[PDB]
Amino acid sequence: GNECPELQPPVHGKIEPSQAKYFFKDQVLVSCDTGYKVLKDNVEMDTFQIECLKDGTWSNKIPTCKIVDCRAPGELEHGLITFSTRNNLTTYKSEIKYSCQEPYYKMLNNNTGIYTCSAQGVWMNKVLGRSLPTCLPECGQPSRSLPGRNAEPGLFPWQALIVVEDTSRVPNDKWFGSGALLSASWILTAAHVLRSQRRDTTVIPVSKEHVTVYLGLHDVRDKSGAVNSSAARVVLHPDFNIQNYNHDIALVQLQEPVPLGPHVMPVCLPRLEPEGPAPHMLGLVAGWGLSDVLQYVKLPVVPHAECKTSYESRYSVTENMFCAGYYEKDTCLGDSGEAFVIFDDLSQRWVVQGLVSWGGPEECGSKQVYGVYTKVSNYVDWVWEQMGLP
């Protein structure tokens, strides 16, 4: 059998069987090491067979080994990709790191975010495998620090302005509200802001079409740097009573979710405890209610009993409510559901404790006329349940 010549194995692979000499009708398999596939005619293969023809020629020349390429790694949501090297290799053994966008989002499980391009051409994380990490919004950490004073940009990032334009009435019936960001797609407020006004006692949510919400707004005159979204849905608390304002709490779902920024972040919800914030504890309240800039004030929570009994000489302050205010200037920025936020101890984040529900018709500062607040800790389960959280 006339003999075929010797074979050099391709860079990064082997031939088999490898023998000293090869003769007529001999078969060999060229294959590649782990990170590689045999390349020939633009097809990739695991093995390629070569045969020794009568005339001492081989059927093909020995082909080449291509390194495995995992291509562009999948993009991460609210996250970004850093390549382990400025070359941004995407081929075998190459390494990438996923990080969430900070400080607006934080990564779950503190998973490493380390993906390496595997032999099978798939970006692999030791734990998550092929599956990406998860970026969740960070709440209650304002990008500005605390310096009825005016409000600076980025101070109350969760602060939302609700604008309702009821166009089903002639002329258009228009009013304003205050909202607190819970996540990129949800605003918390008082049910009473979203109640459609009428002569009977039946409770009707305003129409979703008539609602628009602004975020990152400080000067109503400067809508620049401002985010605006219409309403996917309007949800009043199902037990809200327009008569005594019981269960005065509601959400607006945002049709087009907002970009978290230095002037737009959500506030954190309170744990589900039953007690009203301890008396004398100090909270913040920010609103416009009128004014063009946003303003805020520090207010102390007021012993429940005392508030309740003051509102006994005309309605009722229930255990789903707490009061804030002093017993006697203008520290009443809110008619309309503005949040009562308190900086939490442990967590070190701002927590919405209250939604402004009502107050006496009396003059702002009037003797023992305390602002009454929906106790948000009593509705969080309900709030998460609406948001699908739950």
Q: What is this structure, in a nutshell?
A:
By secondary structure, the protein is mostly beta strands. The protein has three helices and 26 strands.
What oligomeric state best describes the polypeptide chains here? Answer: monomer
SSE series: EEEEEEEEEEEEEEEEEHEEEEEHEEEEH
Distance between the termini: 78 Å
The CATH architecture designation of the largest domain is Beta Barrel
Percent of residues in helices: under 10%
- Specify the number of helices: 3
Provide tags for this entry.
six-stranded antiparallel beta barrel, secreted, Complement Module, domain 1, 4 domains, Thrombin, subunit H, 5% helix, protease, monomeric, elongated, chymotrypsin fold, 390 residues, mainly beta, hydrolase
Characterise the protein shown here.
It is found in: Secreted. Glycans are attached at residues 88, 110. The active site is at residue 336. The chain is mainly beta. The protein folds into four domains: 1-67, Complement Module, domain 1 (Ribbon), CATH 2.10.70; 68-144, Complement Module, domain 1; 145-156 and 267-375, Beta Barrel (Thrombin, subunit H); 157-266 and 376-390, Beta Barrel (Thrombin, subunit H), CATH 2.40.10. Helices cover 5% and strands 34% of the residues. It contains three helices and 26 strands. It has helices spanning 191-194, 304-310, 380-387; strands at residues 3-4, 13-16, 22-23, 27-32, 36-40, 43-45, 47-51, 64-67, 79-83, 95-100, 105-107, 114-117, 123-124, 135-137, 159-166, 173-183, 186-189, 211-215, 227-236, 250-254, 282-287, 295-302, 321-324, 339-343, 350-358, 371-375. It has a six-stranded antiparallel β-barrel with strand order 15-16-17-20-19-18. Strands 21-22-23-26-25-24 form a six-stranded antiparallel beta barrel. Strand 21 (282-287) and strand 22 (295-302) form a beta hairpin. The N and C termini lie far apart (78 Å).
